[PDB]
Scaffold this motif. Sequence first.
Motif, mmCIF file in Angstrom:
data_model
loop_
_atom_site.group_PDB
_atom_site.id
_atom_site.type_symbol
_atom_site.label_atom_id
_atom_site.label_comp_id
_atom_site.label_asym_id
_atom_site.label_seq_id
_atom_site.Cartn_x
_atom_site.Cartn_y
_atom_site.Cartn_z
ATOM 1 N N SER A 142 25.469 -21.612 -13.888
ATOM 2 C CA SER A 142 24.401 -21.757 -12.951
ATOM 3 C C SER A 142 23.521 -20.212 -13.442
ATOM 4 O O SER A 142 23.993 -18.549 -13.428
ATOM 5 C CB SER A 142 25.259 -21.154 -11.665
ATOM 6 N N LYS A 143 22.041 -20.531 -13.694
ATOM 7 C CA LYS A 143 21.483 -19.622 -13.688
ATOM 8 C C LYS A 143 21.035 -18.801 -12.721
ATOM 9 O O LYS A 143 21.392 -18.872 -11.593
ATOM 10 C CB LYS A 143 19.751 -19.767 -14.689
ATOM 11 N N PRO A 144 20.515 -17.107 -12.629
ATOM 12 C CA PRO A 144 20.159 -16.345 -11.319
ATOM 13 C C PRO A 144 19.356 -17.251 -10.428
ATOM 14 O O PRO A 144 18.145 -16.954 -10.952
ATOM 15 C CB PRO A 144 20.299 -15.025 -12.458
ATOM 16 N N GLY A 145 19.805 -16.596 -9.398
ATOM 17 C CA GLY A 145 18.182 -16.869 -8.882
ATOM 18 C C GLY A 145 17.559 -16.340 -8.363
ATOM 19 O O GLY A 145 16.734 -14.608 -8.803
ATOM 20 N N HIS A 205 13.065 -36.596 -9.970
ATOM 21 C CA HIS A 205 14.058 -36.313 -10.128
ATOM 22 C C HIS A 205 15.053 -37.110 -9.475
ATOM 23 O O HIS A 205 15.508 -37.749 -8.818
ATOM 24 C CB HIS A 205 13.991 -34.889 -9.300
ATOM 25 N N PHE A 206 15.451 -37.396 -10.959
ATOM 26 C CA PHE A 206 17.684 -38.088 -10.749
ATOM 27 C C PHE A 206 18.089 -37.371 -11.829
ATOM 28 O O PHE A 206 18.558 -37.604 -13.164
ATOM 29 C CB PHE A 206 17.809 -39.815 -10.665
ATOM 30 N N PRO A 207 18.970 -35.923 -11.803
ATOM 31 C CA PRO A 207 19.821 -35.646 -13.026
ATOM 32 C C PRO A 207 20.988 -36.426 -12.490
ATOM 33 O O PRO A 207 21.217 -37.204 -11.942
ATOM 34 C CB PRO A 207 20.106 -34.441 -12.906
ATOM 35 N N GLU A 208 22.239 -35.708 -13.611
ATOM 36 C CA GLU A 208 23.711 -36.781 -13.436
ATOM 37 C C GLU A 208 23.906 -35.405 -13.819
ATOM 38 O O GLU A 208 25.035 -34.912 -14.701
ATOM 39 C CB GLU A 208 22.917 -37.866 -14.854
ATOM 40 N N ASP A 222 22.065 -26.938 -3.604
ATOM 41 C CA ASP A 222 21.859 -25.022 -4.373
ATOM 42 C C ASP A 222 20.561 -25.388 -4.203
ATOM 43 O O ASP A 222 19.865 -26.321 -4.668
ATOM 44 C CB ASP A 222 22.007 -25.763 -5.472
ATOM 45 N N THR A 223 20.088 -24.344 -3.698
ATOM 46 C CA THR A 223 18.540 -24.160 -3.078
ATOM 47 C C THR A 223 17.742 -24.266 -3.854
ATOM 48 O O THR A 223 16.621 -25.256 -3.918
ATOM 49 C CB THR A 223 18.744 -23.434 -2.061
ATOM 50 N N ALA A 224 17.990 -23.131 -5.238
ATOM 51 C CA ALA A 224 16.857 -22.821 -6.179
ATOM 52 C C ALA A 224 16.443 -23.712 -6.507
ATOM 53 O O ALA A 224 15.961 -24.125 -7.430
ATOM 54 C CB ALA A 224 17.043 -21.510 -6.533
ATOM 55 N N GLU A 225 17.756 -24.913 -6.766
ATOM 56 C CA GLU A 225 17.705 -26.035 -7.530
ATOM 57 C C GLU A 225 17.292 -27.335 -6.474
ATOM 58 O O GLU A 225 17.205 -28.667 -7.543
ATOM 59 C CB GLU A 225 18.649 -25.887 -8.938
ATOM 60 N N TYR A 226 17.633 -27.330 -5.461
ATOM 61 C CA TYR A 226 17.110 -28.551 -5.611
ATOM 62 C C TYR A 226 15.796 -28.449 -3.972
ATOM 63 O O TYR A 226 14.638 -29.053 -4.819
ATOM 64 C CB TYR A 226 18.164 -28.797 -4.217
ATOM 65 N N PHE A 227 15.158 -27.787 -3.813
ATOM 66 C CA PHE A 227 14.349 -27.555 -2.904
ATOM 67 C C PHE A 227 12.852 -27.460 -3.790
ATOM 68 O O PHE A 227 12.197 -27.911 -3.582
ATOM 69 C CB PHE A 227 14.175 -26.281 -1.856
ATOM 70 N N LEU A 228 13.011 -27.077 -4.855
ATOM 71 C CA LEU A 228 12.111 -26.398 -5.823
ATOM 72 C C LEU A 228 11.280 -27.349 -6.308
ATOM 73 O O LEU A 228 10.682 -28.029 -6.767
ATOM 74 C CB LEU A 228 13.224 -25.054 -6.836
#
Lengths: 98, 231, 86, 49, 88, 132
Positions: C10-13, F52-55, F62-68
Motif C-alpha cells: 500500500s503506497k501512501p495516500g 480497468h480490471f486488475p487481479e 480503497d478510494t485513492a486506487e478506485y475513485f482515481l
Amino acid sequence: TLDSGSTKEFFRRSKIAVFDKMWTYMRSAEPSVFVRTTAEGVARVRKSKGKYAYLLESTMNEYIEQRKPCDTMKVGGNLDSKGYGIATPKGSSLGTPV
Amino acid sequence: SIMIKKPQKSKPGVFSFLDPLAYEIWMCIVFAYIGVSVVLFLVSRFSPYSESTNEFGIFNSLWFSLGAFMQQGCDISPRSLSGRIVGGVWWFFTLIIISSYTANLAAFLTVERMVSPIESAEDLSKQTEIAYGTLDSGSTKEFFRRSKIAVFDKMWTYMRSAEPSVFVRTTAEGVARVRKSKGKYAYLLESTMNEYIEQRKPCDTMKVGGNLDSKGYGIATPKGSSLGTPV
Amino acid sequence: SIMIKKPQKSKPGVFSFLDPLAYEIWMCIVFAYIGVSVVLFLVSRFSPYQSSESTNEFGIFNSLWFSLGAFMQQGCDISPRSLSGR
Amino acid sequence: IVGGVWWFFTLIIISSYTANLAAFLTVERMVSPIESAEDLSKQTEIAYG
Amino acid sequence: NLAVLKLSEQGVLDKLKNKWWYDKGECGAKDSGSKEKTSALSLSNVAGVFYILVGGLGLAMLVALIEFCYKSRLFDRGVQMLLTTVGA
Amino acid sequence: FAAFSLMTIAVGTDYWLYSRGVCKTKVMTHSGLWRTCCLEGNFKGLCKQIDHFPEDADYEADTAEYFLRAVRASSIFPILSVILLFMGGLCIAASEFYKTRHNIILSAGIFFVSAGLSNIIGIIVYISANAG
Ligand SMILES: N=C(N)NCCC[C@H](N)C(=O)NCCCNCCCNCCCCCNC(=O)[C@H](CC(N)=O)NC(=O)Cc1ccc(O)cc1O
Ligand SMILES: N[C@@H](CCC(=O)O)C(=O)O
Ligand SMILES: N[C@@H](CCC(=O)O)C(=O)O
C-alpha cells in the motif's frame, strides 16, 4: 554459570569451538566466576556494573526482567532447545500414567 | 581469488543537479506556475471600483510568483481578499516542494557506490543462481575435492553436481565464459592471474572479496637429481 | 499457524505530506496562530496617542496576513514598527 | 532575466552547500609524516635503527 | 531415545535445520531486506499538493466573482453589543 | 480556434505514449487513451480498447486506487476542456452580436482559464494512473 548445573556440564562437554574457549576461560578463572545459587548470581550482576555477565535459562531471564527494579536486560538470542519434564525413578509404575 | 564481470556503473551527466525530481514533475511545476500567475492577474485587474489603484499586472504577477517561489521575497503584496487567499496557496505550494528538493539532494550527495554483490563466497555456497567452476587438472580443483571446511564441501558438492559442466579446459576459456555469462557464471583462479586480467583491456572484469589461503610457486625437479640444492 | 496470501504494498495516500507531524501538533499550531495574530492586533490599535488611531496599518486582517506570511518564510511588506508587538 | 537566473543559481548552489555541513566540522584526520621511508635518507631529524 | 538426545546434544539438529531452511534463502525479502536504494521522486508521490493548489485557485476565483456580484447593486453598531453578549 | 483544434486532435488520438506491452491476449505499443493499439509484431494496427480490471488483493473501497481509476478510465476532466473551450469560443463569436453592453466578453475568458485548469488536472491524473 550455576554450579551443579546442566548449563555448566553443557559447557564442559561441549565441542563447538567458541563454547570450548568459553569453557576454557570459565575453568581458568580468578576468582571463581561460578556461583552457588541463582539470586547470588543475580546480585553479582546487579553490583558488577557491566563487568560480570551471567548465563541462565530464558524463562528465568524473562521472569527477572518482569520484576522491579527492571535494571537487568536480556541480550542476544537463544543457544539451543532444552526442555523441562517430570522425573521418575527408573522402572516404577508411575511412569506411563504420569 | 574470485573473478566476476564488473557491473557497468552510471556516470553523472552534465545536468546531474535536476536529478531528485522527475521530468513530469518539472513540467507540472511550470504549468502550475503559469496558471497561478495568470489567475492572480485575473483576480487583480477586474474593475473593482479607481482602476489604476492596484499595482498588479501580468508582468508584475509573472515575477511575483517567481520571487515567491524561490525564497527571495518580493516588492509588493496582494491587498485584495482573493489575491491574498490565492497567494497563501502558492506559499503553501512552495514550502513542500523546495523542502523535498533540498532534503533529497542531501540524500543524493551521500553515496554513489554499488552494493557489492556475492562477496566472500558464502553466498556462492548459499544461492543457486550464479554458477562457478575451476580449471580442470588443476590444484584448485583438487583442493576443493580434498577440502574439509564445510562451506568448501558444499561448493564442491555443487561443482560435482553440475548441469552442464561448470569446469573448463583452459584459463582463457573460463575468461570468455565469464565475459559472456552476464553475471551468471563466476570463476575461480589465483590472485596473480586475477590482477593481470584486471590490468588489461577491456577491464570488464573485477576482483571481489579477499583471499582464501597461502599457496606458492616454486621450481620443480625430479626427485633426487643433483640440480636440487644448486637451484 | 495461519497462512494467507501476500498482500499488496500500500503506497501512501493523498494527505501524506502532513504525515511527519502529529495531528495534535497541527492543532496546537492552528490555535497558536490564531492567538498570536489576535494578541498582536490587541497590542496595536490601542488608542495610540490628527492621526491618533491610524498610526499603524495593522488591522485584524492585516495581522492575520502578517502571521501567515511570517510562518512560511516570505516576509510581508509591513513591519510591526513599534515596541511590544515585536 | 539576469536576476531570476541569479536566483536559480543561488538556490542550487547553497542547497548543495548545506547538504552535509556538520560532517565537515568534526573530521580529525591524521598527519602521517613519512610512509615509504626515504626521508630517513633525506632528513637528519628522526632517528631509526 | 538415547540417539535423539545425542543429536540434540551435539547440535546436529541445528546443523540440519540450517541446511534445509536457512541455506536455501531464495525468494526476495530474506536476501534483499537489508539493502538500500537512495530515491527518485515521482509524481505519484506528490499529487495532493497540486490538487490543493488548483482547488484554491478555483475557490479564490469564485470569491472574486461573488464580490463583483455583490458590489454591482458589522451592521448596526448597537446590536454588536447583543452579538458579543450572546457570544460571551 | 487553434487551441480548440489542438485539444480536439489530442483527445481524438491513439498516440500518446510508447511502451512495451501486448496487443490482444486470450511488443512496442502504439498506446493512447483507450485504444491501446500496437505495431511491430505479428500484426500491426489492431487497436484493443482498454479499461480497468486488475487481479489484486480485492481492494474493497480503497478510494485513492478506485475513485482515481474511475476518473482515469472515463476522461471527464480532459473532455471538459473541449466543453469550456468551445463555450468560450461561442462567447467570443457572440462578441459582435448583442454588443455595446461591455460585460459579455468578460465571461468569455473565464472558460478559457478554467479549461486550462481542467487540462492540467487531467494530465496529472493520467500520469498518476499510468504509474498506478
Ligand atoms: N510615499 C512614497 N512616496 N513612497 C513610499 C513607498 C514605500 C515602499 N512601498 C516600501 O516601503 N516598500 C518596502 C518593501 C520591502 N519589502 C521587503 C521584504 C523582503 N523580505 C524577503 C525575505 C525573504 C527571506 C527568504 N528566506 C529563505 O528563503 C530561507 C533562508 C535560507 N536558509 O536560505 N530559506 C531556507 O531557510 C531554506 C532551508 C531551510 C532549512 C534547511 O535545513 C535548508 C534550507 O535550504
Ligand atoms: N534445569 C537445570 C538448571 C541449571 C542449568 O541450566 O545448568 C538443571 O536442573 O540442571
Ligand atoms: N599452479 C596451479 C594452477 C591451477 C590451480 O590452481 O588449480 C597448478 O599448476 O595446478
